[PDB]
Every structure is written in C-alpha cells, then in structure tokens.
C-alpha cells in the first residue's frame, strides 16, 4: 500500500499530517 | 509509494525532510 506521513513542528505547534491511498 | 514531509524547527536549526518511495 502507498501512504504518506508528514510532521510539522515550529514555535509551539505540531501539525502531523497523513494520507493513504 | 511512501511520501514523507516534515518541518521541525528548534533553537535555530530547521530540519526539513522531503522524499517519496
């Protein structure tokens, strides 16, 4: 399977993005 | 495929990552 994992963290925030097909 | 994109930053160094299998 194909998936995608993203993780953003700056200042004091954390935006963990994701996705799958 | 496996995509990966993150953007973590601390102190004064931004660790960015980008790549897809």
From Swiss-Prot, chains A, B:
Q: Which residues form a coiled coil?
A: none
Q: List the disulfide bonds.
A: 3-20
**According to its UniProt entry, what is the function of this protein?**
Has antimicrobial activity against the Gram-negative bacteria E.coli and P.mirabilis, the Gram-positive bacterium L.monocytogenes and the yeast C.albicans.
Q: What name appears for this protein in its UniProt entry?
A: Arenicin-2
